[PDB]
Design a binder for this molecule. Structure first.
Ligand SMILES: *[C@@H]1O[C@H](CO)[C@@H](O[C@@H]2O[C@H](CO)[C@@H](O)[C@H](O)[C@H]2NC(C)=O)[C@H](O)[C@H]1NC(C)=O
Ligand SMILES: *[C@@H]1O[C@H](CO)[C@@H](O[C@@H]2O[C@H](CO)[C@@H](O)[C@H](O)[C@H]2NC(C)=O)[C@H](O)[C@H]1NC(C)=O
Ligand SMILES: *[C@@H]1O[C@H](CO)[C@@H](O[C@@H]2O[C@H](CO)[C@@H](O)[C@H](O)[C@H]2NC(C)=O)[C@H](O)[C@H]1NC(C)=O
Ligand SMILES: *[C@@H]1O[C@H](CO)[C@@H](O[C@@H]2O[C@H](CO)[C@@H](O)[C@H](O)[C@H]2NC(C)=O)[C@H](O)[C@H]1NC(C)=O
Ligand SMILES: *[C@@H]1O[C@H](CO)[C@@H](O[C@@H]2O[C@H](CO)[C@@H](O)[C@H](O)[C@H]2NC(C)=O)[C@H](O)[C@H]1NC(C)=O
Ligand SMILES: *[C@@H]1O[C@H](CO)[C@@H](O[C@@H]2O[C@H](CO)[C@@H](O)[C@H](O)[C@H]2NC(C)=O)[C@H](O)[C@H]1NC(C)=O
Ligand SMILES: *[C@@H]1O[C@H](CO)[C@@H](O[C@@H]2O[C@H](CO)[C@@H](O)[C@H](O)[C@H]2NC(C)=O)[C@H](O)[C@H]1NC(C)=O
Ligand SMILES: *[C@@H]1O[C@H](CO)[C@@H](O[C@@H]2O[C@H](CO)[C@@H](O)[C@H](O)[C@H]2NC(C)=O)[C@H](O)[C@H]1NC(C)=O
Ligand SMILES: *[C@@H]1O[C@H](CO)[C@@H](O[C@@H]2O[C@H](CO)[C@@H](O)[C@H](O)[C@H]2NC(C)=O)[C@H](O)[C@H]1NC(C)=O
Ligand SMILES: *[C@@H]1O[C@H](CO)[C@@H](O)[C@H](O)[C@H]1NC(C)=O
Ligand SMILES: *[C@@H]1O[C@H](CO)[C@@H](O)[C@H](O)[C@H]1NC(C)=O
Ligand SMILES: *[C@@H]1O[C@H](CO)[C@@H](O)[C@H](O)[C@H]1NC(C)=O
Ligand SMILES: *[C@@H]1O[C@H](CO)[C@@H](O)[C@H](O)[C@H]1NC(C)=O
Lengths: 162, 421, 198, 49
């Protein structure tokens, strides 16, 4: 097998040799040479994703490993993983490329920032004041809605056979 | 045999009406799931693990892994789109004023608490508390794009906007309005005049505060109120657990461990055996993905409904019946919850009704007088005109009635004098 | 990117169909992926099982495609029902539902056709150039409390007017646009003023 | 294979023999004699309603 062997707090009985888990995989084991208890933990793994600004703008990319503490692998540690190739910025803008856990990345070099939630505002509320419009603006907006998809048909014999 | 309900025969007759003389401000809840947990699977390592010739054999089957990964990614982005659609409805983050006097109304139970480290309202904290391991098989949970802090900030912004500016902030710039005046506007929306609110403001404030307290206690003391969100969590957990236990099946093969089979036989039948195993695991994963897709579609329908509710009941007043709670809708306040949103629908409910004798019109000097907005009633000797939803008798004059023809065509017209100022 | 949804529909269908056609050249554990070569290579006793597993694989791929198509069709049908409701309620009439037919107060909308879809042009009314004022709930006059009929009481600093809620158009406070309800001792925030009698 | 054979303008390189479509099925072929280039198109087919 392959994994990381660590000192175990498990204390199974002298007759008891191995140790399984929910998925029926050996996760605890006993050394034949010296009777001690070990845990089997799979080596660090995760998915990798590429933060690209588009080949029509630049060829730089930012690589995002998913769910790994990058002490075990221009380096930033987020909740989603450890991001390499983009530097954290104290400012906040709108979300351009979503990373996860409130972090978004954008190209200006590639920067990663905490997304700006919205334009902060405070209205002057009081118990004898009101505000009334004196003018208006006629606004026109669009809304696109798909209605039907393409009608398709298949020929069983022509496809399954030749 | 289950009981249909309490029998209730109402006294109907062709000259009797019932008019409420009092009301009751009622607050109800409505829990709606919005998004489910984003999961990603590692096909190459779930199907085989550490065996490389197993992956070599898998490569001959095709791009099933690619299709599965694409479907899961689509679901994952759909969840974030659902959250954006439901919550990110205001582009400006409003703040409540430092002084928290709103004409007697008490909003401390829904406004954010600075004492809490997470800046969450007490009801939000209770909801989080009332709703609740290691899978190296390749099943991972992706974090949501919007953390709970940001969702709480959206909810606080919506509450501040709907408290300080009424519904104006949902259709343009926010315009400040004193809260009693907004409440009067909302009563005027449901056919009850403003003087009704203004003449008993303190009673309505007390009723609202008591209702909010009752809702907090009811959520605290009832564990089944948040059933839908817990069902979401349980469905996902049990689906993942079944997928995990699907690994300990031989699928008709002589054994269910890769290294065992690789060590016990030669390639000529080890290939057939591993083909059987990989095919079985692929069907299991495909079934999991299909169920995930169906559940995601259902959750998306629920999220669209929640977004409509937020747009209509919160950012405005809804005339649709029972859409924003039982009774006449006044306003609603949203609260965040794990994988969902909770609405507090404030509504108007009539009470203490009283029977009366009514007539369609009044015949006077050969003319028939109809009510402009009210209804003709009479305690037994004198006739008055009053609005439909509240008992406010008024002297019948020529300013709250209009004339239409003579009194020879209407059925049920009665004789009375009409005062002229 | 304005027309993203319709292009997404087209792309989804095209890529699903292309995946179906590319999966046809998959071995499925065969010696060869061409049934003719299988037919000119082996005895029918084993050509039978070879073709059996190949055909089963192709049939499974087709079943998966049909299921995906069914799910996408259900989603598109939900969208089409929403579009029909939007047409019926915003085009054939005026809707008071908030944000259903565009941001702001809805006035009217015009439909436009599109490939595998429809496009709505929502015309809406948006207030602007707001101005602050001092307001009062009612006016006390000769021991009577006057409430607005449909308007709101505002004051520019010295005089009081009654105006409609959504637009500034001050009017002199008379007994025509106000109604009396009780004395001015019970309401909170009432202000003294005269009410002109025409 | 079964189909209709038509004159083709596909420019095979001198060493190339066959021609493949997306689905890895022969589409253009070179006859052994006269060293000509041809297209293979399946015969007409469709559904009946
Ligand atoms: C109407 O008047 C009020 C107060 O007289 C204004 O409220 C202030 O607006 C300024 C504008 O920058 C802010 O800096 C203050 O903080 C506001 N006061 C409070 C207490 O918050 C209000 O802005 C005026 N209306 C308009 C449209 O300008
Ligand atoms: C309401 O707004 C409109 C534009 O939004 C104002 O119309 C403008 O008036 C100025 C001054 O007369 C002109 O120079 C512009 O050309 C006008 N705009 C348009 C589109 O015609 C209008 O004046 C505003 N209302 C008030 C009462 O000031
Ligand atoms: C108004 O009057 C009507 C009849 O005068 C009441 O109807 C009766 O109510 C009593 C109360 O229990 C019932 O026992 C009778 O059976 C009812 N009559 C019929 C024909 O069903 C009505 O309840 C009165 N309204 C109120 C609020 O008390
Ligand atoms: C309308 O109903 C409310 C309660 O629903 C009544 O208020 C109660 O009045 C009694 C006697 O005055 C008090 O003992 C209670 O404490 C009040 N309740 C509350 C919540 O304050 C009110 O009197 C009713 N109005 C009419 C006209 O009958
Ligand atoms: C609004 O409601 C809150 C919560 O019910 C009130 O806070 C209570 O205040 C009293 C005395 O100040 C305390 O004894 C209670 O323990 C408080 N409640 C809680 C839950 O802590 C508050 O007084 C009400 N009024 C205002 C103006 O905030
Ligand atoms: C119906 O309502 C009218 C109006 O309030 C009542 O008439 C008044 O009744 C009170 C109490 O008896 C008297 O003090 C007033 O003088 C009456 N006004 C007039 C103009 O007569 C009437 O009594 C009510 N009917 C019943 C059966 O209660
Ligand atoms: C309402 O008033 C009219 C007129 O004052 C009443 O009509 C009279 O009815 C009596 C009784 O039948 C006749 O003798 C008169 O000739 C009628 N006069 C007219 C001008 O119609 C009518 O009856 C009254 N309503 C009720 C219910 O009695
Ligand atoms: C508030 O509005 C009223 C009504 O327009 C103003 O009263 C008029 O003001 C103009 C210009 O100051 C005078 O020419 C008129 O004679 C006034 N009318 C009356 C009946 O006095 C009032 O000045 C406004 N207040 C402020 C502070 O601008
Ligand atoms: C509104 O007007 C009323 C009546 O003109 C005022 O009531 C008077 O108030 C003074 C001083 O408070 C007393 O000495 C009088 O006895 C009161 N008369 C009556 C009939 O109530 C009231 O003070 C005014 N309020 C404001 C804010 O101007
Ligand atoms: C294992 O054998 C070595 C000698 O080869 C010895 O030193 C050691 O004590 C043995 N271990 C145990 C647990 O007896
Ligand atoms: C308005 O609020 C202030 C404190 O914020 C208070 O002093 C004042 O009395 C209030 N006015 C009314 C009419 O209630
Ligand atoms: C009114 O009702 C009574 C009994 O319900 C009936 O006899 C009478 O004909 C009715 N009259 C009218 C005008 O509806
Ligand atoms: C060789 O092929 C060509 C093709 O047209 C044919 O004309 C010729 O007769 C062939 N030669 C022999 C010897 O068959």
């Amino acid at each position: 097998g392959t994994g990381v062997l660590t000192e175990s707090n498990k204390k199974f009985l002298p007759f008891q040799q191995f140790g399984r888990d929910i998925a029926d995989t050996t996760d605890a084991v006993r050394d034949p040479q010296t009777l001690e208890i070990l845990d089997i933990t799979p080596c660090s793994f995760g998915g990798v994703s590429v933060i690209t600004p588009g080949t029509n703008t630049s060829n730089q990319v930012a690589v995002l490993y998913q769910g790994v503490n990058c002490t075990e692998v221009n380096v930033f540690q987020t909740r989603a993983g450890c991001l390499i190739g983009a530097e954290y910025v104290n400012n906040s803008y709108e979300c351009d490329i979503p990373i996860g856990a409130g972090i978004c990345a954008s190209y200006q070099s590639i920067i990663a920032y905490t997304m700006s939630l919205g334009a902060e505002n405070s209205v002057a509320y009081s118990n004898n004041s009101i505000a009334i419009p004196t003018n208006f603006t006629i606004s026109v907006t669009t809304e696109i809605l798909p209605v039907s998809m393409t009608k398709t048909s298949v020929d069983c014999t022509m496809y399954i056979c030749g | 045999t289950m009981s249909l309900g309490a029998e209730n025969s109402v006294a109907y007759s062709n000259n009797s009406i019932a008019i409420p003389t009092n009301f009751t401000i009622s607050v109800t809840t409505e829990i709606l799931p919005v998004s489910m947990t984003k999961t990603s699977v590692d096909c190459t390592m779930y199907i085989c693990g550490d065996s490389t010739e197993c992956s070599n054999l898998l490569l001959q089957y095709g791009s099933f892994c690619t299709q599965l990964k694409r479907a899961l990614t689509g679901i994952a982005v759909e969840q974030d789109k659902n959250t954006q659609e439901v919550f990110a409805q205001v582009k400006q983050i409003y703040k409540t004023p430092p002084i928290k006097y709103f004409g007697g109304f008490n909003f401390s139970q829904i406004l954010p608490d600075p004492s809490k480290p997470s800046k969450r309202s007490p009801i939000e904290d209770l909801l989080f508390n009332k709703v609740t391991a290691q899978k190296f098989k390749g099943l991972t949970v992706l974090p949501p794009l919007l953390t709970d802090e940001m969702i709480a900030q959206y909810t606080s912004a919506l509450l501040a906007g709907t408290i300080t500016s009424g519904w104006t902030f949902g259709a343009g710039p926010a315009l400040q309005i004193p809260f009693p005046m907004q409440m009067a506007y909302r009563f005027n929306g449901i056919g009850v005049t403003q003087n009704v609110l203004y003449e008993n403001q303190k009673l309505i404030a007390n009723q609202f505060n008591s209702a909010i307290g009752k809702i907090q206690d009811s959520l605290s003391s009832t564990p089944s109120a948040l059933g839908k969100l817990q069902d979401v969590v349980n469905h996902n957990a049990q689906a993942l657990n079944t997928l995990v236990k699907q690994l300990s099946s031989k699928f008709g093969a002589i054994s269910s461990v890769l290294n065992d089979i690789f060590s016990r036989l030669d390639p000529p039948e080890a290939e057939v055996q591993i083909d059987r195993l990989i095919t079985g695991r692929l069907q299991s994963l495909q079934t999991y993905v299909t169920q995930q897709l169906i559940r995601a579609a259902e959750i998306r329908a629920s999220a669209n409904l929640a977004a409509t509710k937020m747009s209509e009941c919160v950012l405005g007043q809804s005339k649709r019946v029972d859409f924003c709670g039982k009774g006449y809708h006044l306003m609603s306040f949203p609260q965040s919850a794990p994988h969902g949103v909770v609405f507090l629908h404030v509504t108007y409910v009539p009470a203490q009704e009283k029977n009366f004798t009514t007539a369609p019109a009044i015949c006077h000097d050969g003319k028939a007088h109809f009510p402009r907005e009210g209804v003709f009633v009479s305690n037994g000797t004198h006739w008055f005109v009053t609005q439909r939803n509240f008992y406010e008798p008024q002297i019948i004059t020529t300013d709250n009635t209009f004339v239409s023809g003579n009194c020879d065509v209407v059925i049920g017209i009665v004789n009375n004098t009409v005062y002229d100022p």
